[PDB]
Design a protein around this ligand. Sequence first.
Ligand SMILES: NC(=O)c1ccc[n+]([C@@H]2O[C@H](COP(=O)([O-])OP(=O)(O)OC[C@H]3O[C@@H](n4cnc5c(N)ncnc54)[C@H](OP(=O)(O)O)[C@@H]3O)[C@@H](O)[C@H]2O)c1
Length: 316
Amino acid sequence: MASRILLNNGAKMPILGLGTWKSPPGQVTEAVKVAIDVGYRHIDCAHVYQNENEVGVAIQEKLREQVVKREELFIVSKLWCTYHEKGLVKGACQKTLSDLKLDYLDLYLIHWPTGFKPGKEFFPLDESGNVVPSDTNILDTWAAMEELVDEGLVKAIGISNFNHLQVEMILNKPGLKYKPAVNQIECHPYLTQEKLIQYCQSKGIVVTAYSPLGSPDRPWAKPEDPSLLEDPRIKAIAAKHNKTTAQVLIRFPMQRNLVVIPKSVTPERIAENFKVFDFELSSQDMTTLLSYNRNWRVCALLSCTSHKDYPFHEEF
Ligand SMILES: NC(=O)c1ccc[n+]([C@@H]2O[C@H](COP(=O)([O-])OP(=O)(O)OC[C@H]3O[C@@H](n4cnc5c(N)ncnc54)[C@H](OP(=O)(O)O)[C@@H]3O)[C@@H](O)[C@H]2O)c1
């Protein structure tokens, strides 16, 4: 199937990207260089991952070496929660641009709907541990994002971890100038997201699936948690197709018209993970993988469950 999907800003986005959350700063430059060498043209980044400088070193060498042209790359980053204030959004975007060594981003996302007190700490907590919110609302933050488009710093803006009523709030914003191009959400066979995906797609919002392999390196993993990569039912589908389990887990969202961003710092897996355009899951296989849903989340933002904009109390 086609390697890019068209966004509602008129640009095309590669449906397979490289994730960089938890990629160590001393390994991610090589990981991104290898990814671009073996075909990746989309890199998913974020300021809160604390490795954008090192990602940028890789992008800049491959541009300098003329392995790729800037127009052929699709670089994504995300506004962290402590920068939702109007007077802080441009500088947060410009810090990311400087670190990535870019003059524009292809896509910039609000990382979470929850704004936090600005300061040095990414998770400012009170005298009892609760996240300290900011009195920013989603709509003024969105307006700040819209200005970034009008200043040329980003080609597209979007959202991440927004539930459907939060997406709706932006779509119904008075004076809305640019619709979100993307909602990036967790999605895999144990969290299949059928309701939120259908909502977003019905509105021409492209969905990106994060943690598609179930994030086995997540810092809070527990031996007793489910494991997609070890699920014998998914291994059997892989075996049937003579592919790896990870390749089946990456092809699965692709066939739902999603974008997907598997993370690896291992050269062999970076290359393996891109070899997903040569096979097809049947509709039966797709329905079977959807049947594994258990509403299980990797990323539940547990420190923020009382924030007014916490996204995961709503069904979807
Ligand atoms: N918007 C958000 O809030 C949000 C949240 C979470 C994630 N994300 C984005 O989504 C990306 C992907 O999600 P994720 O990092 O949580 O996890 P993931 O992509 O589901 O899983 C990454 C893990 O799987 C391993 N792996 C990769 N390929 C493999 C293969 N072929 N065989 C076996 N294991 C394999 C990696 O190991 P090695 O690296 O050691 O090879 C790493 O431990 C992130 O990196 C980030 O860019 C966004």
